[model samples]
Target: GPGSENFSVATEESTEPLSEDDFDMFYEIWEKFDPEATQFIEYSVLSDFADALSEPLRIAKPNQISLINMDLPMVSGDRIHCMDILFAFTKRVLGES
Candidate 1:
């Protein structure tokens, strides 16, 4: 009787995986908390993240190149330096000092 429970999944692509009704509920909850009240998804921020991720992949490497570490080519050294300072401040705030 333990295995007789209703675990019925007819096929792999069954609509039961994530019912449309459930997705509607999720959409309502997610939209409520979104920062941009006007737009559900911020296209500009999404584009920026995609551009950051693509820079490394789009490079044309030489025949014998072992490896390449990619960083934000568009990001200024001043901003990166400021981020380091902010992280150090966090450590101090947490009583690391």
Candidate 2:
């Protein structure tokens, strides 16, 4: 049930599937996160969305854990927070934020 919570949360948080406009805003903010890689992402050069949203968003989906741990000092421990941004994005798109 480890990952089940994430799935349930994601399902419960969004009323519907992501829209084109939703994708647009997510893409724009992600680009704002790393403008230098903006063109790469826009042109489909970068093959991963999660990787792109990792840094500036400050929440690793799952695969970015090792990379983040390598970059930051884990004094005691750490956790991989995946849904915070996704939920926030849903709220923003739904005008709840």
Candidate 3:
């Protein structure tokens, strides 16, 4: 339900499938998060979108949780937040932030 609640907001505005322009806008928003994100992405070669920042964007897709670019070392503190970045990303992408 959470996934639907989240993604639906983006698509709920209209009755249309995700478009290339939407992808472009999302990529632009993602690039602002990490300019050097490409270095961590899983792409062997760059694409033809020259005006865009880099090859494939580094941020993982919704299904790519296993391939997070940043490493998380175990912490002993109770206040430590391993899911900080992930939650923020979700909140932002879902427009709940």
Candidate 4:
């Protein structure tokens, strides 16, 4: 019962396109969010994040720009690996509990 709690999601169709500033923020930080020391698996995951964000650029918006939400998955062997800066950056971009 402790784990049971309702979470809200956006059900209504958003006419307002995701924010460009948010996407720009992600890209600005992403340039410095190096993964040179990261393993192949983790590197690939981060790359995937980049690919996911590239699409909306095609759809030009006059004002509102969309921000991508990253739903990261657990690594195969250890859950803790490659998560130190990842978590911190995500929090800096998103939030920290």
Candidate 5:
């Protein structure tokens, strides 16, 4: 019987704009607070999570965490969809576009 090959994670150098490590680190911190992987965390605490993420990516912290929420409270109220925030915030803020 032939053995299956190990899928290489570090494939060819990614030509993407940012490093996968950016979100990879952020997502790990995400699971730390949400071991259940519930996909949502407190809106209040996201302010802090934002700090740990930006620190590694070399992007500006952008000072006021208010910029993150900006009055659009989630329908779930007090909790937020992690993917929604990360995709938008990182793309807009981190991508520098």
Candidate 6:
């Protein structure tokens, strides 16, 4: 009987259950778009790129609110982030909808 501190944070569980297969395919095209993997994909094809994504996930076709909530990015420029975009999307699917 010695559990006072209450350990809980890192050793968490994954109940949301996102799809790995999705990322697998996404990354393939992501690299294809990014090519150099310089951390972003062309803003021009960003729309079409998002379109190619599996139906399960969506970028809202430029949803400012959703992007803000998802913590993607907002700027007066062209191009979309890679890790940020991936993490943001992953977060969305992993969390409650």
lDDT of 5 by residue, 25-77 (tens): 87877876677988888867666666556554323455345445453347476
Evaluated against the true structure, the overall lDDT of model 2 is 0.41
Preferred candidate (lDDT higher): 2 or 3: 2
Q: Please report the candidate that would top TM-score against the real structure.
A: 5
Candidate 4 lDDT over 1-97, as tens digits, reads 4443655544775555446575575554444444454432343334444443344332223211221233444556423243542443345344444
Worst 10 residues of 4 by lDDT: 58-67
In model 2, which range of ten residues has the least summed lDDT?
A: 38-47
Which stretches of candidate 6 lie above 4 Å from their native place? 1-13, 59-71, 74-76
Instruction: Give lDDT tens digits, candidate 6, residues 1-97.
Output: 4465864457655665666788787888687677887878755666666656775566646645455455456343766678767776677667745
Question: Candidate 2: misplaced stretches above 4 Å?
Answer: 1-17, 38-84, 91-97
**In candidate 4, how many clashes are counted?**
5
Regions more than 4 Å wrong, model 3: 1-16, 39-97
For candidate 3, write residues 1-97 as lDDT tens digits: 4565456534435543234664565456545434675322222111112123332332433423432333322233322231343333334345552
Error of 6 at 94 (Å): 2.8
lDDT at residue 27 of model 4 (Cα atoms): 53
**Model 1: how far residue 31 lies from native, Å:** 1.2
lDDT, each prediction: 0.31, 0.41, 0.36, 0.41, 0.63, 0.66
* Candidate 4's TM-score: 0.26
Show the colliding residue pairs in model 1: none
Q: For each candidate, what TM-score against the reference?
A: 0.22, 0.25, 0.25, 0.26, 0.60, 0.57
- Which model is ahead, 3 or 4, in terms of lDDT? 4
Model 1, range 16-72, lDDT digits (tens) per residue? 223445334433443443445443323223232222322222122331121112222
Q: Is candidate 1 or candidate 4 better by lDDT?
A: 4
